[PDB]
Each structure stands twice: as C-alpha cells, then as structure tokens.
C-alpha cells in the first residue's frame, strides 16, 4: 500500500501499481529507486537545542531498518554520545552494516549526561534516521546521521539522466557541544528548489585494475555526485510525496518481522506482473491494455 | 516441491504452480499466505512428562528458521530453563529477532538439571517450534514456544474476510515445574472443529498519529484476532495438509544455506509467472491458459 510516483517529462504523478500502469513503460528493474530526502530542506530548525526536542526514549518497540539507494547533501548532521548519570550507556552500539551518513557539511557532536527512560531513542515526529543508504527508526551510538524521509518512485526509460554524474572534495567541520539534563502540490513551510544528490553507481567504475577490492577505492570513494536545479516544481513535488509516504511505510515496517528490509521494489514488480498478465487477459478489454497490430 | 493448497467456495484442494491453475485466479501476492497450526489440535498429549519425550539432543546439524504469517491460539505453551549438572547452560540464547509465542493460555515453565548430549535440542517427530511468526527447528533458552507445523495457502481472490477481525480478553497463567534427569481427508486421531486464529495487523492500524513508533502500541498490541468455527471440513483438511507438507519443507530447509528464510512464496510466484507465460506459447496451445474470447 506504499505509494509510488511516476515521472513523465519532468512531471510527478503519484499512482499505485494497481492503477492501470501500462501506458507508463516499466521495462526493467533499473527504473525502480528510492530516494532519501532529508528534513532540513523543508524549513525545520536545525540547531542542537531545537533538534533535540524531536527525539524521545521509548521502551517496548523493536527497531527496523530500510534500505534506500539515493540521497541528498546535508548541511547539518548529528553524532550523539549520551550517557546515564551513573556512567551507563544510553544508545546501543551500531550494528556492523551501519556506517555514518556521507556528504555532511557540519557535524554537531553532542556529549553529556541525561535521564534515559527507554531502551531506544525514536523520532517524535515519525521520521527516520539515515545512515549511509540504510534508514533506521532508532539512534545508534557514535554514528553520524541526518533525519529525513524516504520515497519510492519509477524513473523514465532513458540513458539514466536522473542520478548521473554532475548534470548541472568536500570538507566537514567539527562542532562540539556539552549538554546536561538531556499532481502532488507542495504544502510544506518551505521547499528547496535545488537537489544536490549523491548516489552509488553499479558498474562503470573500473579502469586499469581498480575493480579488485585490494586495489580499490575506500568506502568513501564509491559515491557519484550530481546536481539538479533546472526544474523546481518536480523537486518540491518529490519532497511533499516523500513526506506523505511515511505513514504507509511505518505501518509496513511494524507489520514485518525482518530486521532489515531490502525487498520492497521487487515485491512491487512482482505485484505489477501478477496484476497485468495474471491470467486470461482479453484483447478488447481495457484490463489487458495491449494493442492489435 | 513444497505443496500448496488453494481455496474455492470453502473447499481445499492441493496442487502446485506447475499444475495448470487458470480458474484459480492468482492476481496479487496478498493471496499468498502461510499459516502455522498448533500440534495440540491433532490430539497429542500436552502435559510436561509426555511432551518432554518428544525432544532430544543432537550435535552436527545447524539450525534453520522459517517464518509464518498467521497462527492459532495455543492452550499449552512451554518455557525451558534447563542446565547441565556442573552448572553450564544447555540451550543457546535466543537471537535478537526471536520473541515468545503470543496468545498462550497456559505457560509451563520447566527448569532443572539433566544430561545434554548434543549442541541443540530437536523435535523427534519432525515438527517445528513456533516463536512469534518465526518457526525454528531448535529450542532457545527462556523463550516461550508451542509445537506446530506450517502450511502454505492461496487465499480466494479479493474476499478480504479470511483472517479478518472477529468474523465468527487475553489472560495467561504460569505453571512452574522442576525436573531432574531431563480432496484432502483428515487422518489424525482428532481434528479441532474450531480455529481461533491471530494474525499480524493488516497494515493500517493508526488513527491519531498512532503510526509513529514513539506514539505506538507495544510489541503485543499489534495482532488482530478472529474465529472461523463455521466450516468443519475446511479446517480439518487444513490441519491434515499442514501435517503432510512438513517433509518437503524440512528437506528444503536442509538444502538451503540461509539462516532465516523469508522468500518461499515469492519464489513460488516467480515460478508460476515463468511457467504460464514462459514464452513462445500458442493461442490454441493449453500451456498458456489464455482465452481468445
């Protein structure tokens, strides 16, 4: 029941996979992607005193993790090291697959004591915490993150102009704090017209003998940057759609029992194939929307 | 090779994807569901002395885990805390994703000392141990379970009443023990003519920002309950089918190398699609059941 958007001539139209998607060409799984847009582009306050108020502690709900493929540059990122008054830790250690959020401008590292009344720290507004192509609902200890939401969409069939290399390195500074007592229409306060994205590119990154993991780039050299500013209606439409799709995603995560979910788009593709050529589709009937000759 | 049963007009028939299912309308993956039925509904003895004799220890076989999506209310559940004579534990600690079986009327806590020949404890009759929508072949320490088997079904097309909310209150009692020296026709001793089931939430279960995990129900307030006493042949046929499918599931779990298997029904759907629309079929050919008019 997770909504997904279809892009046509740089125009975004939301429609579920059921809704007669045959005039919209879906040829391969390369057209399905998920984008991790962050909240700071919606006009929310980003300083530490006001950002802290959006996170609270809750005991009794297991954490969940969702994979996302493309992201956005973040001006502000956070890194928590909260401890209990008696010296005990509050935040769980990050699992092995979790890494810090790439492409951060500033990293606000927060340290100090506070009352920790739960097992995990959740987002009071329902958003996610993004850690390097893995969105999570809880805060892990000592890993850089940026709060945001993730949206699913179907790309047009082309040379992959979307999420390419600079259509039209970086320095992250240290800011330390000490604390005690711790057609879709855009309708957000503000929307950022420019989308400065980063993404990982399957294949096409091996020259000489650089595909060997030994003679290869480190974990921070994989990403391919870009920039998209020509159209601003599509960008704010994507942001609004990303805000809307959070409810269906949170409930789906609550229902499932898998620790990390990597198979939403594959399930959508299987659903599409089963809806369309499921059985005994008629030539004249609009349900089997094919053409004669 | 795992058998699956299809339901039409409250009748159960066993078939497979390779057998031509054309009237059997498979349009979406929502019709593919797996249910785990308790082993006590077949008339087996449930008291501790008799139930203990069905579990034995073995070393040299790795454990395997498979999921199920719908369960059944259990009259008797068990919780083992045994240990070796020298004080060392016999049962491994439960993994992170494993939780106790929900909806248990009674819980028998068994604790004591006894010989522990093998690494893990298996079921001598080949059945599974059910852990909150995760069926395992071994017993984990201090976790409530209930013996049962798993069956795979194809629900009737878009009827929405199967596994619903009360089609036509939870109190658990703990009893403590101490031990020392530790088409389908029903063909079981007895079959229960009522099926009081529980299932995970049908996604949408949130009204007043209850979808936020912070402002959300705990891990025990998720499930939806119902009751299906109307039919007698259907559910006893279901019990017998779940009895039969264990051999194939166990062999498949032996063959695979995944720790937890979540992708059986998806593979079945892929097989069905690749079979009936494989390619180069004929209008008059019966391989692809297509109706010209």
């Amino acid at each position: 029941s997770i909504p997904l958007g279809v892009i046509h001539n740089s125009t975004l139209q939301v429609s579920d996979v059921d809704k007669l998607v045959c005039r919209d060409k879906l040829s391969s799984t390369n057209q399905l992607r998920s984008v991790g847009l962050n909240l700071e582009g919606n006009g929310v306050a980003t300083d530490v005193p006001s950002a802290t108020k959006r996170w609270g502690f809750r005991s009794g709900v297991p954490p969940k993790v969702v994979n996302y493929e493309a992201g956005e540059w973040a001006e502000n990122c956070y890194n928590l090291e909260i401890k209990k008054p008696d010296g005990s830790e509050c935040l769980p250690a990050a699992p092995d697959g979790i890494r810090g959020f790439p492409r951060c401008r500033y990293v606000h590292k927060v340290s100090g004591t506070g009352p920790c009344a739960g097992d995990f720290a959740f987002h009071k507004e329902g958003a996610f915490f993004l850690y390097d192509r893995l969105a999570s609902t809880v805060i892990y200890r000592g890993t850089t993150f940026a709060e945001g939401v993730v949206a699913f969409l179907i790309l047009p069939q082309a040379k992959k102009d979307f999420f390419s290399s600079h259509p039209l390195g970086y320095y992250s500074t240290t800011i330390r704090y000490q604390a005690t007592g711790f057609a879709i229409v855009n309708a957000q306060p503000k929307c950022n017209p420019n989308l400065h994205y980063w993404t990982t590119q399957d294949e096409g990154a091996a020259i000489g003998l650089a595909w060997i993991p030994y003679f290869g780039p480190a974990a921070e050299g994989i990403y391919i940057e870009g920039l998209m500013h020509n159209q601003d209606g599509l960008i704010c439409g994507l942001r609004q759609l990303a805000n809307e799709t959070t409810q269906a995603l949170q409930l789906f995560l609550r229902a499932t029992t898998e620790l990390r979910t990597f198979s939403i788009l594959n399930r959508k593709a299987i659903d599409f194939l089963l809806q369309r050529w499921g059985g005994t589709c008629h030539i004249l009937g609009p349900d089997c929307c094919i053409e004669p000759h | 090779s795992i058998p699956l049963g299809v339901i039409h007009n409250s009748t159960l028939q066993v078939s497979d994807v390779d057998k031509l299912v054309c009237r059997d309308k498979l349009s979406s993956t929502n019709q593919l569901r797996s249910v785990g039925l308790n082993l006590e509904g077949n008339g087996v003895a449930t008291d501790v002395p008799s139930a203990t004799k069905r579990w034995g220890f073995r070393s040299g076989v790795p454990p395997k885990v498979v999921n199920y999506e719908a369960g059944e209310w259990a009259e008797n559940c068990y919780n083992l805390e045994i240990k070796k004579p020298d004080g060392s534990e016999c049962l491994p600690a439960a993994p992170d994703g494993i939780r106790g079986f929900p909806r248990c009327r009674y819980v028998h806590k068994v604790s004591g000392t006894g010989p522990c020949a093998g690494d893990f404890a298996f079921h001598k009759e080949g059945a599974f141990f059910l852990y909150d929508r995760l069926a395992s072949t071994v017993i984990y320490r201090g976790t409530t379970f209930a013996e049962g088997v798993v069956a795979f079904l194809i629900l009737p097309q878009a009827k929405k009443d199967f596994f619903s909310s009360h089609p036509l209150g939870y109190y658990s009692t703990t009893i403590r023990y101490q031990a020392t020296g530790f088409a389908i026709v029903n063909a079981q001793p007895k079959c229960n003519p009522n099926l009081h089931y529980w299932t995970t939430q049908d996604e949408g279960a949130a009204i007043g920002l209850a979808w936020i995990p912070y402002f959300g129900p705990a891990a025990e307030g998720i499930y939806i309950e119902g009751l299906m006493h109307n039919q007698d042949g259907l559910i006893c046929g279901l019990r017998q089918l779940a009895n039969e499918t264990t051999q194939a599931l166990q062999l498949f779990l032996r063959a695979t190398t995944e720790l937890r298997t979540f992708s059986i029904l998806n593979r079945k759907a892929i097989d069905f699609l690749l079979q009936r629309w494989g390619g180069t079929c004929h209008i008059l050919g019966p391989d692809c059941c297509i109706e010209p008019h």
Partner: nanobody
Amino acid sequence: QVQLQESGGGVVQAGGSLRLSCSASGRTFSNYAMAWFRQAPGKDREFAAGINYNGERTAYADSVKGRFTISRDDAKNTVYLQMNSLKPEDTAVYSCAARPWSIANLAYTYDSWGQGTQVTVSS
C-alpha cells in the same frame, strides 16, 4: 473521532458562484487540518483544497487554483469553500475530510470523513 457535516450543495448555472460548509463536532477543532475532496462520476477521489490548524498555509490543486478560496472559523467549528467561475467539468461529489495538524494530498492519511454533498453545474 470528530464527526463532519457538509451542506450548501445544489444546482447552479455555469459561471455562477457557490459556497459550501463543513461543521465539525468535538472541542479540539483548532488542532485539526481540513481539506476538500471531489469525485467526478466514474473517477477516483482527488484533492481540491486545504488549510492548517491555524490558517497560515492553504494549498490548492492546479485545476481549481485561483477560482476556489478556503477559510476556517475556529469560533464556529466550520470551514468554507468559496467557488467562483464554475465550469461544467466541476460537477462532482464534494467531500469534507479532517486530519491532525498538517496538510496532505493523499486520501489515506485522513482520519475523519463526511458523507459528501452533490454539486451539479448546468451548461
């Protein structure tokens, strides 16, 4: 929670004006956002207009932008939709929806719904 009750529908000539209303029960009206949905015959439900819990951000669909104005009165627990320069393709069933502080386009994010009223414009 929160029951809704629309009124003011009817039949109007093309190019005329019409105004709808939607009264909400309860006493936490100022904490909710209101939106109007319309359903053309043989078509799905779609978004028309909206407003916050404080009336500082109103969003309109492209089809009705510039012709429809939406306002709310917290002292009477009612919202209004003023319609101007009506066109023959505006004939549909207009529905009233309520949801917690915010503004949304998709219909599945809304808590309370009204039964809707019929608006028919004649050429």
